[PDB]
Amino acid sequence: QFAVIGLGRFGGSICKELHRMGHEVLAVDINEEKVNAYASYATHAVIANATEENELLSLGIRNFEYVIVAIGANIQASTLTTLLLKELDIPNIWVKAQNYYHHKVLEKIGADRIIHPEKDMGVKIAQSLSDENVLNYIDLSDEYSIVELLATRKLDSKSIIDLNVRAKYGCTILAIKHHGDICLSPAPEDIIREQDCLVIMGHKKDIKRFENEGM
Amino acid sequence: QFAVIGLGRFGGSICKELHRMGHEVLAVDINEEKVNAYASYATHAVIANATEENELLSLGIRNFEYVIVAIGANIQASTLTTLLLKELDIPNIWVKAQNYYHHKVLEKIGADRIIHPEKDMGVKIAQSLSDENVLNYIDLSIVELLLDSKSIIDLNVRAGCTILAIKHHGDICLSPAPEDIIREQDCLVIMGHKKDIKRFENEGM
Amino acid sequence: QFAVIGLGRFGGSICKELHRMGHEVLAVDINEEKVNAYASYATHAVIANATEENELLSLGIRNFEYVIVAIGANIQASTLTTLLLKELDIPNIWVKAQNYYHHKVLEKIGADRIIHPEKDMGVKIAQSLSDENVLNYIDLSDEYSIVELLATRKLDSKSIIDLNVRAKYGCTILAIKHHGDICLSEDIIREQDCLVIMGHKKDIKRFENEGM
Amino acid sequence: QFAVIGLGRFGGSICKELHRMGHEVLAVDINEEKVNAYASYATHAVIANATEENELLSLGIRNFEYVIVAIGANIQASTLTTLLLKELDIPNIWVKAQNYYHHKVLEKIGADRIIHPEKDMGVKIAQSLSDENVLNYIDLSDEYSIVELLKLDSKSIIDLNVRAKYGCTILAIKHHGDICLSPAPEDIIREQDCLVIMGHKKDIKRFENEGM
Amino acid sequence: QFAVIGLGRFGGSICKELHRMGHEVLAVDINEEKVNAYASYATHAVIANATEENELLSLGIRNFEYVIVAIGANIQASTLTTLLLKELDIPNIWVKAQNYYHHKVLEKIGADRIIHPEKDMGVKIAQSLSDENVLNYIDLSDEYSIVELLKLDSKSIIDLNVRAKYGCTILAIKHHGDICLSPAPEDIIREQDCLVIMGHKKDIKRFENEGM
Amino acid sequence: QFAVIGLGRFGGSICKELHRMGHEVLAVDINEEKVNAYASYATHAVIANATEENELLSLGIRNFEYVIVAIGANIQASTLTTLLLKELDIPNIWVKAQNYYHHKVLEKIGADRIIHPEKDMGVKIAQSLSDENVLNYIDLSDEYSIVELLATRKLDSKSIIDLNVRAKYGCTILAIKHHGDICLSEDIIREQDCLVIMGHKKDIKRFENEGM
Amino acid sequence: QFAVIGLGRFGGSICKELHRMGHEVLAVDINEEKVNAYASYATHAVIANATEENELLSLGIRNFEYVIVAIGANIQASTLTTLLLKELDIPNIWVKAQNYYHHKVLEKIGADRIIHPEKDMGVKIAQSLSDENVLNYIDLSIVELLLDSKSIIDLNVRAGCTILAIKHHGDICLSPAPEDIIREQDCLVIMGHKKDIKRFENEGM
Amino acid sequence: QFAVIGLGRFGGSICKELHRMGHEVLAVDINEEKVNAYASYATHAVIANATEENELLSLGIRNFEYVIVAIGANIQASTLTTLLLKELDIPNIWVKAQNYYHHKVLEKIGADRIIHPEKDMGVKIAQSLSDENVLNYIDLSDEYSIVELLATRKLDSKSIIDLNVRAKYGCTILAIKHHGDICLSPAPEDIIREQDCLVIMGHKKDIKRFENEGM
Numbered sequence A, H: 001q002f003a004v005i006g007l008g009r010f011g012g013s014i015c016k017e018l019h020r021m022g023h024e025v026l027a028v029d030i031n032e033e034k035v036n037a038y039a040s041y042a043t044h045a046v047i048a049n050a051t052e053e054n055e056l057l058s059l060g061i062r063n064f065e066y067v068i069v070a071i072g073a074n075i076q077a078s079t080l081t082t083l084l085l086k087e088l089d090i091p092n093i094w095v096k097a098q099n100y101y102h103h104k105v106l107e108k109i110g111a112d113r114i115i116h117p118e119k120d121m122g123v124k125i126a127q128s129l130s131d132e133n134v135l136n137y138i139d140l141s142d143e144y145s146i147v148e149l150l151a152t153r154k155l156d157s158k159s160i161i162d163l164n165v166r167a168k169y170g171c172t173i174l175a176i177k178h179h180g181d182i183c184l185s186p187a188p189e190d191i192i193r194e195q196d197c198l199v200i201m202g203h204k205k206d207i208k209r210f211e212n213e214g215m
Numbered sequence B, G: 001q002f003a004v005i006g007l008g009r010f011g012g013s014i015c016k017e018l019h020r021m022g023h024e025v026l027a028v029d030i031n032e033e034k035v036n037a038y039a040s041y042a043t044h045a046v047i048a049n050a051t052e053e054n055e056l057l058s059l060g061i062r063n064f065e066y067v068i069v070a071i072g073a074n075i076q077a078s079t080l081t082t083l084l085l086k087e088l089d090i091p092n093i094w095v096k097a098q099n100y101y102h103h104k105v106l107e108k109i110g111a112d113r114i115i116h117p118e119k120d121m122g123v124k125i126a127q128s129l130s131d132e133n134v135l136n137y138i139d140l141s142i143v144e145l146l147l148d149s150k151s152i153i154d155l156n157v158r159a160g161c162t163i164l165a166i167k168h169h170g171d172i173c174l175s176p177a178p179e180d181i182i183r184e185q186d187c188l189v190i191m192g193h194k195k196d197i198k199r200f201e202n203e204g205m
Numbered sequence C, F: 001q002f003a004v005i006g007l008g009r010f011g012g013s014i015c016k017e018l019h020r021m022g023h024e025v026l027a028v029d030i031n032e033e034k035v036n037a038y039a040s041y042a043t044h045a046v047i048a049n050a051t052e053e054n055e056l057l058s059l060g061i062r063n064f065e066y067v068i069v070a071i072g073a074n075i076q077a078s079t080l081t082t083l084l085l086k087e088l089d090i091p092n093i094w095v096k097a098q099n100y101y102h103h104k105v106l107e108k109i110g111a112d113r114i115i116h117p118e119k120d121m122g123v124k125i126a127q128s129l130s131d132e133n134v135l136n137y138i139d140l141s142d143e144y145s146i147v148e149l150l151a152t153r154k155l156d157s158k159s160i161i162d163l164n165v166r167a168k169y170g171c172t173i174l175a176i177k178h179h180g181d182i183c184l185s186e187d188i189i190r191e192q193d194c195l196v197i198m199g200h201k202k203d204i205k206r207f208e209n210e211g212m
Numbered sequence D, E: 001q002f003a004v005i006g007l008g009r010f011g012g013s014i015c016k017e018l019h020r021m022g023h024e025v026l027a028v029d030i031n032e033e034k035v036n037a038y039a040s041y042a043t044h045a046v047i048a049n050a051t052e053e054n055e056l057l058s059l060g061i062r063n064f065e066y067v068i069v070a071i072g073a074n075i076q077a078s079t080l081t082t083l084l085l086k087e088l089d090i091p092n093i094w095v096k097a098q099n100y101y102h103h104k105v106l107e108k109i110g111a112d113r114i115i116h117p118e119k120d121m122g123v124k125i126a127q128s129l130s131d132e133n134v135l136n137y138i139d140l141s142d143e144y145s146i147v148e149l150l151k152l153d154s155k156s157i158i159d160l161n162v163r164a165k166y167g168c169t170i171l172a173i174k175h176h177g178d179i180c181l182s183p184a185p186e187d188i189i190r191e192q193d194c195l196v197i198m199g200h201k202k203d204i205k206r207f208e209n210e211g212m
């Protein structure tokens, strides 16, 4: 189902994770040490130069629905591989882009998805930096947001009704997380300890106010 | 409030985003072109060698609560900068790690947060690969999913997940009534057991 | 009608020749000295970074039916330029390829013709090495060929009927070149006159063997 | 009979072609991969530093009538090799020139032929660019050209007279790989039949404009 | 008992000395010549890259109670090695610091002792420069010093009283490798006999000025 | 009285210390930042290229009894400076040697003392490694030694007569150091007080073994 | 009249000497310090890259009858310069050769004289080593030699070399009379057979 | 009698010449090819690192009256060698200097003669350049010079008395060279051909005038 062609910082991580999730993954790399290191983290692992057409055929690359081209540094290799993958009619080709220029040729040679990992992680880090309290969020509208909050101290050993969040800020607490054991829909008396995960829902400004005052 | 010391693929992105969100950001880089290119995407932008102690002082680096050290490639420069920042008593120092080794010294020289961008994006991509259907998620799982013209009672999700919202036309139905129509381009927000959601995906979609 | 984007060993030569032939040519280069040096050998010459989209627009690059991308060394620049040219709907984009890899991306980003100058000149040189008599040829069939021959000592000061080629080997001499003045169709052939022969490939080859 | 000293874009092409033509060729290169890659495209292939006199002797370089020095980039290596080849009394030494300067020393150290591949390919491309539609051409003079050309359909030589109207002589017709060498006044030209035309460049170009 | 990781001006000296003192020492260096040169001045000598974890294990580095990291120039290598040594639970890790910065990371990665050889030798030289003529000295405080010193000849401790006049206590006399440990008031001091003196630095310096 | 010519890790340290001791010191360096940084740690500080004879004259270098050449890396500069200093009749020229070779030329061009800082610090470190108890020592004979010891936990809060050292091992405690204030000659010894012992080497070593 | 293109150990020495002799010399070098250092030892001194054709034209290089190409190390630069000089029709081009190979191309690109300084100085040193006694010589041998208070008749050199001169006190006795005293610090100039002179050295000295 | 320690452009030339003159020469070099190449041009040739004291002893370096240190480039090696040679009490140590600095230390470590080959050849070339006619000269005084002249053409096929040089310029022609066969003291009728070597003596200005007019 999945082949990952570059086992580096990025490709290796995709590989390890797909495998941990339970999908079958073919790990490909030109470097023998890398292939050895990923033997345990992939269904199969093979030494191959992904820029070599017969080597790609030998991997049985067409038997794959998704091929990820994760060779970062070598722009030539990356596009040459992508080029070959498009020739072999691969349904989904995802490629890591090195820079603006690399993005542009990948776009034209028919990459299905182009990833800028650092750029994307930049946004995520900035999101983290601006509200440290928020671990995760989902934007429902311009105005509404579901927010996973890490409990700052003053919120310690307090029940739902202790700070009633429906009356005060007009937000609904969706869950509590204690010990990797969750309280899915809390009763009015359920204790929130420090470092429990609050899941809160409603108006963005109301949550932000609750953060300002209850934390 | 924020200073970003390396304006590259990673640091530049952090900078541009904080600025876009409305925070004030000092952009620092050794390279003049980079500093020029980020003039518009930062409150202030200054040429500086972040490994030079007097240059850091000159930036007024202590007036900052968060300093991000985003010079990727040069492991020496990165740790030397971090080292200097810890000397100047910066409250929060976030550094991009190049490899395992780099992580280790940053850990010991008192980096407050150490980021492995590619590693982290790997996980996120694998999540995406594994279920192409989800737009956003929060692991507690709450899942934003992208059933046409069917009500909430038309498919009774509790009988074991709870539909939290519908998005039609950038107008959301926050907690839907049992007879609220879901169209095709619509943003289901679903909550509960991970396997139950996956099953709902398999069968209702 | 023509724009040449890289004025180097290759691009400059194309430019100089189109101009010498009487066509109008826009010469483009990033380097100011190159642009200065080609001022006399082009209708117009402009400093421009061909990888910069607004700079291309400013050249009025769309007013051109043929754009030649001759930037040799920089594979990135070459393909980025080609990419931009294809975006601007240029009807004919001809690019010099650096290597196999370069050829492949140019092929996919819609280059209309891809030139390997050294590769092609290799063939021509080997042709030249193999029979030092010939200078140019056109293949009509598997059997027939028009051949431009450089004359040896052996047919020096000879007329057409001195070695009658229609009888002896059965080829028709099409022209003689004496001093950049051509006898189109008893005419004396001097050494280093260009013989233009036509007919059967083997007959010509025999005439070479015997008359030269 | 032939040795090619630089297997590169240029030298490799000369080698591959001489071999394909059936001549015996010794391929030489300093780089082992290049030598391996040309094993199949040469009579013999050997690793050698062509700037090293004893290595040249070991190749049996004197047993060769033609040595091609095709190392492009390294001007020093190129001229040092040429220099050594001239010492060993090689009858024909052909060298690829990198620039004007390189040409000049090669000229003085007794290179028999000096090739500028890109320069020469420039001219050929410009010729192609000027008249696309002549599948092939041979330049006789500045003024005169033989042109292979691809309304004309179902018309004879008498019905379309070119000696009078444009002043050009149709040399041949090609119908399905079966050529009419010198057409009788009534011979039918069908679409896609190869016209061979000869005479004044402007007259041909006019005939193209009007008859096509 | 001891391993020395950098055989250089500094590390080599530590190695040679521990060996000369009779301790067993493992000498490590990446450079084969250095390892060869220290074969005679160490219990064992091994080629190893001290920044490579498996190579460290192979040395049996944990069997050592003291590891000295003496690679001067390469700050990266130095700290990476130290880092690995701290991972392997070495009880005592002594490292040569290159500069202030280097000191700081070594401090944080748990170096047990950090040496600045030139800095420390600076102090010792300045001490020598200040008072040349004290063959040897030990600094007790900023104010107090024990001094070995080389008019004084043929005079006793009673004839030259130092407890009263300068306020210093003569600790010993050395006559021909045969020492008078604590001199009786009448013991003769001959020229070139080693005076040991103790007390206030300025008092000694005054005694030097006047009695010598 | 003293000039220091290289203000680096080594020279700067000598300079700072002579100044701290109260001597007057001229600090010289080619680098302006170094000269600025040592303005506070020297009587005078001057920018000068010590390899330039007129620059040396301008410093009034002859007015000095001791010149220290501390330029480490640049062997040429170091010896050229030393050479010039010997020409100007300087009474004492002390130079830091980079390597064996450097030592040899300095020896011949009349350096009065040649220092190998790292080599010398190596010995001192090995001494320290071998017995972690001691800090400083003076060798009186083959048999006798004055030793500065750093106190362990075992003699913490003990008086002189608590472990009477004159009876038990037969050594005389010369001083105690508590907090940079010294008890020169029932006095409590706390941990990290500096013991100053004197007598037989083996007796001290025994006292170390048993009392610590 | 003379241009010297490389002001190094060799070219600088040629320059300084021609100037000292009184000829006018143009000193050329790519390095600004060298050009500065030779300002006093040349009629004119100019910064120029001698491998650049327009720079050569700008020097007015054609106004010169002799151009010396003295860039030692860089064989490429040396021959490229020589090549350009031959194009500009310079009447006399003298070049320092680096090795055998360098000699060969310079020979073919039309260098008028090719100098191997070290090789040539080798011969001269060996001459000096072999007979330490001679101050100067000319191989036809005429020998300047550095017998106290003895006349020309006191040692009859013809009975088989001819003493050409004596030097006392920077006052020379051009062709000495048979009774002319030779002192110790005196400059004998002797002529004839090489072996005869050597023998005279062996026996009279 | 002579040892040459560097067989390079300079040292090799000294070696080859001393040998050609008939003296016995020990050629030393660190490089084996150099030692092989000079086997024929020296009495003995030995591989040695001249900076290594025991290697010098092994050569029997003290048995030599003259040692020439001709390692050009490596200033360290050159001075270290010289230093060792001075320790071994060599009577004459001649060293090639690389630059001003090198000269200075060699001077102090007791080099007996210091040679700057290029500098010296510079002077000789400039002498050649300023009077091309003169091949060789000896300065007798400020005013007087013996000059070896190469016959320029107009001097062709003329006897001594044809241009009487004692009357005209008041110089005495000392010799003629035809075919490496010399006419030592020419008779008044001896023919001078082009490319014969004129040896002329007398006043510097008179010779210079004779050059101006007879050539």
Ligand SMILES: Nc1ncnc2c1ncn2[C@@H]1O[C@H](COP(=O)(O)OP(=O)(O)O)[C@@H](O)[C@H]1O
Pocket (backbone or CB within 6 Å): A005, A006, A007, A008, A009, A010, A011, A012, A028, A029, A030, A031, A034, A048, A049, A050, A051, A070, A071, A072, A073, A074, A077, A096, B118
């Ligand atoms: N032609 C190729 N075929 C297969 N794998 C390749 C090829 N070229 C490079 N790689 C592999 O791609 C991986 C890229 O990893 P890395 O340089 O860390 O990039 P990233 O920073 O994106 O992880 C390396 O493990 C490398 O061995």
Ligand SMILES: Nc1ncnc2c1ncn2[C@@H]1O[C@H](COP(=O)(O)OP(=O)(O)O)[C@@H](O)[C@H]1O
Pocket (backbone or CB within 6 Å): A118, B005, B006, B007, B008, B009, B010, B011, B012, B028, B029, B030, B031, B034, B048, B049, B050, B051, B070, B071, B072, B073, B074, B077, B096
């Ligand atoms: N010593 C330094 N001081 C300040 N900025 C630096 C220093 N070294 C590098 N930088 C800047 O940091 C940025 C690193 O970005 P980049 O090379 O893209 O790596 P990354 O992938 O981590 O973003 C560059 O803009 C670079 O100019």
Ligand SMILES: Nc1ncnc2c1ncn2[C@@H]1O[C@H](COP(=O)(O)OP(=O)(O)O)[C@@H](O)[C@H]1O
Pocket (backbone or CB within 6 Å): C005, C006, C007, C008, C009, C010, C011, C012, C028, C029, C030, C031, C034, C048, C049, C050, C051, C070, C071, C072, C073, C074, C077, C096, D118
């Ligand atoms: N980004 C660019 N835009 C426009 N012209 C360029 C750019 N990059 C290089 N060039 C020009 O293209 C030409 C390439 O010539 P060259 O490298 O000699 O190739 P060749 O020898 O094959 O013609 C140079 O004249 C250079 O100035």
Ligand SMILES: Nc1ncnc2c1ncn2[C@@H]1O[C@H](COP(=O)(O)OP(=O)(O)O)[C@@H](O)[C@H]1O
Pocket (backbone or CB within 6 Å): C118, D005, D006, D007, D008, D009, D010, D011, D012, D028, D029, D030, D031, D034, D048, D049, D050, D051, D070, D071, D072, D073, D074, D077, D096
């Ligand atoms: N000293 C040498 N002896 C023999 N072959 C050489 C030497 N130096 C370079 N070569 C070969 O000459 C070839 C030059 O080819 P290349 O650089 O592609 O130029 P071009 O593109 O003009 O052919 C290279 O394949 C190289 O291996």
Ligand SMILES: Nc1ncnc2c1ncn2[C@@H]1O[C@H](COP(=O)(O)OP(=O)(O)O)[C@@H](O)[C@H]1O
Pocket (backbone or CB within 6 Å): E005, E006, E007, E008, E009, E010, E011, E012, E028, E029, E030, E031, E034, E048, E049, E050, E051, E070, E071, E072, E073, E074, E077, E096, F118
């Ligand atoms: N990675 C490494 N592992 C082991 N030894 C090393 C490594 N890198 C350098 N060394 C050795 O450390 C020594 C450092 O010595 P040197 O450069 O003289 O510094 P110092 O003068 O301070 O001793 C060198 O001999 C070198 O061979």
Ligand SMILES: Nc1ncnc2c1ncn2[C@@H]1O[C@H](COP(=O)(O)OP(=O)(O)O)[C@@H](O)[C@H]1O
Pocket (backbone or CB within 6 Å): E118, F005, F006, F007, F008, F009, F010, F011, F012, F028, F029, F030, F031, F034, F048, F049, F050, F051, F070, F071, F072, F073, F074, F077, F096
């Ligand atoms: N020609 C010179 N004249 C005067 N000072 C010099 C000269 N060359 C170098 N220096 C100075 O000598 C010092 C050498 O210090 P450094 O290289 O750190 O040696 P170390 O670390 O052993 O003290 C530097 O401060 C440098 O500025």
Ligand SMILES: Nc1ncnc2c1ncn2[C@@H]1O[C@H](COP(=O)(O)OP(=O)(O)O)[C@@H](O)[C@H]1O
Pocket (backbone or CB within 6 Å): G005, G006, G007, G008, G009, G010, G011, G012, G028, G029, G030, G031, G034, G048, G049, G050, G051, G070, G071, G072, G073, G074, G077, G096, H118
């Ligand atoms: N391309 C060039 N154009 C002009 N001058 C040059 C060029 N390259 C080198 N030079 C100068 O020529 C001189 C060479 O001198 P040097 O290196 O001492 O060699 P040598 O021993 O032949 O004198 C230097 O002064 C150098 O700056």
Ligand SMILES: Nc1ncnc2c1ncn2[C@@H]1O[C@H](COP(=O)(O)OP(=O)(O)O)[C@@H](O)[C@H]1O
Pocket (backbone or CB within 6 Å): G118, H005, H006, H007, H008, H009, H010, H011, H012, H028, H029, H030, H031, H034, H048, H049, H050, H051, H070, H071, H072, H073, H074, H077, H096
């Ligand atoms: N330590 C050494 N002992 C002996 N010979 C040496 C040593 N170092 C260098 N040489 C030799 O000295 C010679 C110097 O030659 P070269 O570099 O041509 O100088 P030059 O230009 O003066 O001739 C070389 O042949 C080299 O092998």
